[PDB]
Nucleic acid binder design. Structure first.
Lengths: 139, 158, 49, 114, 56, 99, 144
RNA sequence: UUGUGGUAGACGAGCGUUGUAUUGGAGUUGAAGUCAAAGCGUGAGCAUUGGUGGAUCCAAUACAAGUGAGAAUGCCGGCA
RNA sequence: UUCUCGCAGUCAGACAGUGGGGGAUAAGCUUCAUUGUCAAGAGGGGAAGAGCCCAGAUCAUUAAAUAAGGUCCCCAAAAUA
RNA sequence: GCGAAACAGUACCGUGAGGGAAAGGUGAAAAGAACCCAGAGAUGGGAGUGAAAUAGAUUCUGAAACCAUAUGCCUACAACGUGUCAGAGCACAUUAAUGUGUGAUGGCGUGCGUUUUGAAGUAUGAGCCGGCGAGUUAUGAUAGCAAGCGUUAGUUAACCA
């Protein structure tokens, strides 16, 4: 399907983000929106904004039902994080990594969004072998 | 070179208590600072010694092999006057002799201004002097054109 | 010949490269032994020695 | 004049890493481990190329001897039936494949009786 | 204490396998509107059938 | 059917019109080539070989096996020898092996 | 080249046999059982596929043993605890798990593999004589 | 006929790259780089096609190398 | 395997049988000589082993005859008296 | 490549002397995303622009390691440098080929360079990826190979054009 919801480099630890979005993956919008609205983790509100924007875009831009959509896939793309120096005992310095990541989710409203990739790959191999055989057709 | 360094020769690290390499310098060639021990330098010979006997023998051999060629026809004084400082006549002559793609070279000794003025509209046209042309330009000439009177003198030049 | 097929008359000799390659050896060892100044830089002590 | 050493070296690393295929975890992502695995695999391939012939011969002898024992003799006896009189060029594997068509290797057994 | 060697990625997956989280309780507001969590006061500021506080 | 045929230095059991593989014979594809070094055909037994019985095969193809990349390396020593072996073969089947 | 050795694939066979070892030497019965399970006696043997045949033994408490091995050979079992070893004599084992001793001896005579774990569980040795494993109709015989 | 175990060590003969010199070609109907493939070699290697990509590259002959990267707790950057 | 030129490399060798010495006929010990192995050469047997026993391997082959060594099973192969 | 491709002897360090870094790339021209939607907005999704927006200002190309994801394979009794040769089974149809992907299991099996009397070693060093990263040059001599010249030989240095 369509109506993915990207987000560029929000401050978040990817470790917790993966777990929370694997908890939220699979289910539909409302039955998951209510549960994420009560998530004790702090990341949920940031993801909540993204999912509300995603369903709004799906309804407005794409005209889909929105109710039958569900989280097909979660990925938390790690972006260039921050590195900061903190003094430490015995005269040392330590480089602590302030972690941020790119958050984006996929919405599906069908028994599909998996086969079409296979068809595209098969077509790619088909044109590859067509070119190979056209080269072999030289006389 | 290694004389391009900047700073002291002090050790950046400690003699002991170092769990790293030796690293006794600051701008090592294996380090980012550079300074490779080897590299091109503007002081080599770029030339060597050769003998005139072999040079003359080879030059005479090239003269023979080019006299054996077809498009090496004679040149004289009359067509020097018959040609002018205009590039038109040269191109007409080249077209009438299908010397367009040919690398034909011209031989000049009277130093006529008309000849040297021309031969600049194509990458294959140029003129050279008898004592100013060597074996390469003689054979890269690709069936050049040569004067008439000087050849007998050139016979003495081997 | 000409400058499209020029070849020598068997005027081409081997070059013992001491820095590169392993198929002919000629690498780390570089034919200098395994020990001593002869196996180290600025070797070849004075001929009168 | 200087030459950059990126393209050909990169292609060399590419082909060497592609030589290693069918490995677990951190074994197809580094030059050193891939090269070591390739060399060990080649040595194993040669050693197994011989040991497969040895093992096939051993299994052929085992099942041929089993067939002789159910027919009522040992492996050494059958050798005498051939070597000592009218030696045949029959293969142990082929005599073993004769099991796939039974009551025919038994014709050979009764033929070589002496 | 430092490891003998760096931990493998599959060992990391084993470490985080039991670290997996579960869901939490949910309950429809018997008097207020949208869903809430079990044994909680709704966004309408009340316990089930127990108006005690303003919604906002 | 059943027939033991000695190709090269190895024996193969074959039946009526079976496409199988041997060492390459260096022959054009499509011809008929006869072999007499044949034993154990048509339920007949001979000690070294058999007479009056021959096999007649047809050549279908000449190919190669995979790249046998034999690489020999000795630990802690300056020796690493690489090689890649491609060994020819012939795929062929028997047509009218006489008995 | 190759002769393309034909071998059975995805095939299963497990027959049932039974004997009585009253006064019989352990070693011969053990090696015969090893042959039966490993499938050496078979002529279509395939290692990575089904090999064994279901095996049952009745009245394994009357085994014979030459010499004084009842008081010469001793069997030991040391636990992971310190000094956690117990030692038993041959005559004592005659009233103890000698059937399990036969089990251990024959599994020791089998090649070491995870199939041997599945090979040996097919052996049902009983000190007594009555059991419901006879419902599979074992073939009564001798020299199994 | 001898043959092809192989250290240091030595002889023999090649491959690839950058640029130059001649000579030739190809190129938005598509150049390099790039990844992918279940190709071809006694080897350094050689290609074809797909798509990212959008501007020069390649064939053969020689010429000179800052000409060939697994180690040096090699150097830097990034990632664990 | 005489001789000329060129590159060498090398005086950290070890071990086994045999003649020894020292040591204590003790040494996985040391120092001399002979033969052999490894270094500088993989494998088979001795259960595992650098030096023990066979020998010197281009590669491929689902062949055999054998060598040292073995035929109750694990692990291919025998029994007769 | 001047340390400096720029606001480079800059930032920064050290009181001071002194030491001393890195980093370039939009599009033909900003024609630089009007406007709408989610939100507080950055932003994200549409529309439009432009040939083209995987050309949207993190704006030439975007490799490897690293991380997330899913097609299929198999696995929770398994003693293993994680591999090799066979091998069922599972899923497909391929740089057209006795095809691949994967491998329940069987057969076997203790890494790389250095140093050496020997290193699978409880000797040494390597977290990893990418890039950089060490036999050149001048002068002189000796020897080999090839060529030219020569029978009163060969050869020009500096220098002149």
């Amino acid at each position: 399907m369509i109506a993915f919801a990207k987000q560029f480099r929000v401050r978040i630890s990817p470790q917790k983000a993966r777990l929370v979005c694997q908890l939220i993956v699979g289910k539909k919008t409302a039955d998951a929106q209510n549960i994420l609205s009560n998530t004790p983790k702090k990341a949920a509100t940031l993801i909540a904004k993204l999912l509300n924007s995603a369903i709004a875009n799906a309804t407005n831009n794409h005209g889909m039902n929105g109710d039958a959509l569900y989280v097909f896939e979660c990925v938390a793309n790690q972006g260039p994080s921050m590195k900061r120096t903190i003094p430490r005992a015995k005269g040392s310095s330590n480089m602590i990594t302030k972690r941020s990541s790119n958050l984006v989710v996929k919405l599906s409203d069908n028994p599909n969004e998996r086969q079409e990739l296979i068809k595209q790959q098969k077509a790619l191999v088909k044109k590859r072998v067509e070119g190979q055989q056209k080269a072999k057709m030289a006389r | 070179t290694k004389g391009e360094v900047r700073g002291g020769g002090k050790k950046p690290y400690k003699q002991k208590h170092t769990g790293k390499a030796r690293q006794g310098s600051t701008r090592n060639p294996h380090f980012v600072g550079g300074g490779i021990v080897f590299g091109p330098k503007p002081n080599r010979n770029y030339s060597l010694k050769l003998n005139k006997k072999a040079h003359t023998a080879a030059l005479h051999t090239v003269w023979s092999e080019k006299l054996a060629s077809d498009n090496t026809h004679l040149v004289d004084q009359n067509l020097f006057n018959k040609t002018e400082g205009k590039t038109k006549v040269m191109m007409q002559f080249l077209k009438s002799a299908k010397l367009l793609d040919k690398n034909v070279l011209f031989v000049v000794n009277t130093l006529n201004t008309n000849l040297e003025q021309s031969t600049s509209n194509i990458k294959n046209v140029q003129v050279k002097h008898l004592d100013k042309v060597s074996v390469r330009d003689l054979m890269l000439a690709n069936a050049l054109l040569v004067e008439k009177e000087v050849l007998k003198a050139l016979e003495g030049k081997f | 010949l000409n400058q499209l097929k020029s070849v020598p008359k068997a005027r081409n000799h081997k070059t013992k490269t001491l820095g590169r390659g392993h198929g002919s050896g000629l690498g780390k060892t570089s034919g200098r032994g395994q020990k001593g100044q002869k196996a180290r830089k600025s070797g070849l002590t004075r001929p009168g020695f | 004049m200087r030459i950059k050493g990126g393209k050909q070296t990169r292609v060399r690393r590419k082909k060497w890493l592609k030589q290693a295929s069918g490995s677990f975890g951190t074994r197809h992502a580094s030059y050193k481990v891939a090269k070591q695995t390739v060399i060990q695999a080649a040595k194993y391939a040669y050693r197994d190329r011989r040991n497969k012939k040895r093992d096939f011969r051993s299994l052929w002898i085992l099942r041929l001897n089993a067939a002789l024992r159910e027919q009522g003799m040992t492996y050494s006896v059958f050798i005498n039936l051939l070597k000592k009189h009218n030696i045949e060029i029959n293969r142990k594997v082929l005599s073993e494949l004769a099991i796939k068509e039974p009551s025919k290797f038994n014709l050979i057994v009764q033929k070589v009786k002496s | 204490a430092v490891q003998q060697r760096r931990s493998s990625k599959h060992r990391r997956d084993k470490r985080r396998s039991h670290d997996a989280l579960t869901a939490q309780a949910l309950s429809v507001c018997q008097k207020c509107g949208k869903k809430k969590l079990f044994h909680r006061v709704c966004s309408c500021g009340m316990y089930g059938d127990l108006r005690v506080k303003k919604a906002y | 059917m059943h027939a033991i045929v000695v190709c090269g230095s190895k024996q193969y059991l074959v039946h009526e019109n079976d496409t199988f593989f041997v060492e390459k014979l260096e022959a054009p594809v499509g011809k008929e080539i006869q072999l007499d070094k044949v034993l154990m055909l048509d339920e007949k037994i001979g000690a070294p070989y058999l007479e009056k019985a021959r096999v007649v095969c047809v050549v279908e193809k000449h190919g190669l096996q995979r790249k046998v990349n034999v690489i020999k390396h000795i630990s802690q020593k300056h020796h690493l020898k690489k090689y890649g072996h491609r060994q020819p073969y012939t795929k062929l089947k028997v047509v009218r092996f006489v008995h | 080249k190759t002769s393309m050795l034909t071998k059975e694939q995805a095939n299963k066979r497990r027959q049932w046999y039974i004997v009585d070892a009253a006064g019989l030497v352990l070693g011969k019965l053990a090696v015969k059982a090893a042959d039966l399970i490993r499938g050496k006696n078979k002529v279509d043997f395939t290692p990575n596929q089904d090999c064994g045949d279901y095996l049952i033994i009745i009245n394994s408490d009357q085994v014979v043993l030459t010499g004084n091995k009842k008081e010469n050979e001793f069997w030991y079992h040391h636990s992971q605890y310190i000094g956690g070893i117990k030692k038993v004599s041959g005559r004592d084992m005659l009233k103890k798990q000698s059937d399990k001793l036969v089990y251990n001896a024959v599994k020791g005579m089998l090649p070491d593999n995870r199939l041997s774990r599945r090979w040996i569980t097919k052996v049902h040795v009983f000190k007594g004589d009555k059991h419901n494993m006879e419902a599979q109709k074992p073939t009564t015989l001798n020299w199994s």
